[PDB]
Amino acid sequence: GITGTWYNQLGSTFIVTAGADGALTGTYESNAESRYVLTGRYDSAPATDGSGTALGWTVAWKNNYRNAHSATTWSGQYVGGAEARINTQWLLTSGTTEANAWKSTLVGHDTFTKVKP
Amino acid sequence: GITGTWYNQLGSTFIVTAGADGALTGTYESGNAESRYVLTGRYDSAPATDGSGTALGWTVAWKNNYRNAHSATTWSGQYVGGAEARINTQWLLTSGTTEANAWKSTLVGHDTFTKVKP
Amino acid sequence: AGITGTWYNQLGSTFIVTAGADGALTGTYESAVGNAESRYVLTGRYDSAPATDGSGTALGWTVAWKNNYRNAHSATTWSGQYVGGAEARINTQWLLTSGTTEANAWKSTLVGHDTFTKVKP
Amino acid sequence: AGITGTWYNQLGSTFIVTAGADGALTGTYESAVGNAESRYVLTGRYDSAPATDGSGTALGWTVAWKNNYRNAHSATTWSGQYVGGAEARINTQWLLTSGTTEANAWKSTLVGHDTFTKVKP
Ligand SMILES: COC(=O)c1cc(C(=O)OC)cc(-c2cc3c(=O)[nH]ccc3o2)c1
Ligand SMILES: COC(=O)c1cc(C(=O)OC)cc(-c2cc3c(=O)[nH]ccc3o2)c1
Ligand SMILES: COC(=O)c1cc(C(=O)OC)cc(-c2cc3c(=O)[nH]ccc3o2)c1
Numbered sequence A: 001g002i003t004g005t006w007y008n009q010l011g012s013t014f015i016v017t018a019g020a021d022g023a024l025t026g027t028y029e030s031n032a033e034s035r036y037v038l039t040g041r042y043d044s045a046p047a048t049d050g051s052g053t054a055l056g057w058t059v060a061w062k063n064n065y066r067n068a069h070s071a072t073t074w075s076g077q078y079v080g081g082a083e084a085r086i087n088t089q090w091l092l093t094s095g096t097t098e099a100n101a102w103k104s105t106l107v108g109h110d111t112f113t114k115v116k117p
Numbered sequence B: 001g002i003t004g005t006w007y008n009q010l011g012s013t014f015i016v017t018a019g020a021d022g023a024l025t026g027t028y029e030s031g032n033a034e035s036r037y038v039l040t041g042r043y044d045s046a047p048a049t050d051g052s053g054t055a056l057g058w059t060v061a062w063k064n065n066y067r068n069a070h071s072a073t074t075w076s077g078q079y080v081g082g083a084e085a086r087i088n089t090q091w092l093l094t095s096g097t098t099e100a101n102a103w104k105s106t107l108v109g110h111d112t113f114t115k116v117k118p
Numbered sequence C, D: 001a002g003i004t005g006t007w008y009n010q011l012g013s014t015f016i017v018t019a020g021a022d023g024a025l026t027g028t029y030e031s032a033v034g035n036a037e038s039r040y041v042l043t044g045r046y047d048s049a050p051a052t053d054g055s056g057t058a059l060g061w062t063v064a065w066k067n068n069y070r071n072a073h074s075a076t077t078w079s080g081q082y083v084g085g086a087e088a089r090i091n092t093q094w095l096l097t098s099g100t101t102e103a104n105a106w107k108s109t110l111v112g113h114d115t116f117t118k119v120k121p
Helices: A098-103 B099-104 C102-107 D102-107
Strands: A004-007 A013-018 A023-029 A035-042 A053-062 A067-079 A085-094 A105-113 B004-007 B013-018 B023-029 B036-043 B054-063 B068-080 B086-095 B106-114 C005-009 C014-019 C024-030 C040-046 C057-066 C071-083 C089-098 C109-117 D005-008 D014-019 D024-030 D040-046 D057-066 D071-083 D089-098 D109-117
Touching: A004 A105, A013 A035, A023 A053, A035 B068, A053 B086, A067 B036, A067 B068, A067 B086, A085 B054, A085 B068, A085 B086, A085 C109, A098 D109, A105 C089, A105 C109, A105 D102, B004 B106, B013 B036, B023 B054, B086 D109, B106 C102, B106 D089, C014 C040, C024 C057, C040 D071, C057 D089, C071 D040, C071 D071, C071 D089, C089 D057, C089 D071, C089 D089, D005 D109, D014 D040, D024 D057
Parallel strands: A035 B054, A053 B036, A053 B068, A067 B054, C040 D057, C057 D040, C057 D071, C071 D057
Antiparallel strands: A004 A013, A013 A023, A023 A035, A035 A053, A035 B036, A053 A067, A053 B054, A067 A085, A085 A105, A105 D109, B004 B013, B013 B023, B023 B036, B036 B054, B054 B068, B068 B086, B086 B106, B106 C109, C005 C014, C005 C109, C014 C024, C024 C040, C040 C057, C040 D040, C057 C071, C057 D057, C071 C089, C089 C109, D005 D014, D014 D024, D024 D040, D040 D057, D057 D071, D071 D089, D089 D109
16 A cells, blocks of 8 residues: 555655565656655555555655755654555764864654646 | 775674765674675765765665665765775664654764774 | 644644744643643743744654553644644654663654644544 | 752753742843843642652743843743752753744754753863
8 A cells, every 4th residue: 555656744655565575665856856765664564454564765866956954854654544644753963074064963853646636 | 985884982883885876785783694784885986086975875675585674774974085094974864754753753873984893 | 813722633643732932832731642631831932033034933842651540651742833824733753752671662662644734633 | 949040051051940849940040140130930840749650850941031131032932850969850842933934944943952961061
């Protein structure tokens, strides 16, 4: 149920393949200048008791056109059904000097759906 | 650089390779083979040249051939090179839960990695 | 209109707060989840002179999960901002830390996000 | 309780607190220099009847970054636990939320961690 195209609440798109070995691979777009590689992992044998499927992935914000010197990790769970969702919290760390490291990391949350909001 | 064997402050072992394409690959051990897990992630392969660190992140899903915790951790942070290289991170650990239990699904913390055991 | 009032989060918890002229938040919190029963004391702070450029009003508060009925040996802090409008809202992210031994400290802190409205969802 | 007194974090900040019998935390948060323009009110809560099994004491507090001299339109909450002894510590994680427009709310909140000791670093 994970493989395919997902859309967050703020206009980003997330195209992922969930491989048989637990791999997540794909592209994240916040135009080619805005598309970035993503990789991660998911539980390939989740429980069948109503619990979600744990997963996570990373995007480093560098491509052939731009580089923000930063990276976001999303940690969350996939929930299947008629209104399937991937519910996540995220951390976005920028490369900083030591003096600025205290303010290097933003935190937030993203909800992804199989239909554009 | 990033490629190498790292240890967090609690003794976990992080064996990583940073590839030319921005890929992180390797294994994470939270001393036995039953405790070794696949990791994948990404890093900035062209960092700034002003003294700033190198941003990165990776994920471990806590399933291997021997155990399955139905959970996954992501680490987000930066590599700081120099005399004692370090990777400073903050992490999120999400378990698969029912909807009624989702409010308590995610733990948060911080790990610092060096090339020497604690 | 303003922060003072009774708010409900997406799970039905009840947040009764007064925003004082000196920047103080005081009131009570009743949790719809966890090892909790009845009302708990909260205190916190808010920006009593927010920017005039359309930005929200920053704030934060703490509940220690001890009252006359129960003690969970834990505390939650909510950090967020109030956003005025036709449907006023307080958007927060929270940290819930339990008292633990050192060996268990790595798993002492849960994290999440709560959104509050003056209308109970 | 062991919490009342002056604490110092890893980056020079100084945390001056009174732990009341009812679970109240009150005091002042300032820089290493301690000039008036760096001092802010703090309020929070702690578990006034912690467990007796060697666990820490859960607590939290908030500072809104407004005083009589400046206003950054933001607030920080620290969530953590106090651990007593000859090397007493308060180990925390924190969230710093700035007031923003809706378009910028995704980048409103920083996260980090502070460790406080009874002696200057
Ligand atoms: C223009 O470069 C980008 O596309 C870009 C750049 C940065 C950055 O830190 O640069 C200052 C951050 C993001 C970003 C997206 C995103 C998301 O969708 N959910 C979670 C966080 C998040 O962060 C995207
Ligand atoms: C036997 O299962 C494990 O080895 C295992 C299981 C879980 C789990 O949450 O299972 C529900 C979590 C970890 C783990 C390690 C680790 C770390 O080193 N830094 C950051 C967090 C973290 O989480 C390891
Ligand atoms: C004179 O103003 C200050 O000294 C000052 C101002 C701000 C501010 O305006 O934030 C927008 C923030 C801090 C501060 C300290 C601190 C800390 O110790 N741990 C966690 C974060 C943190 O933030 C100090």
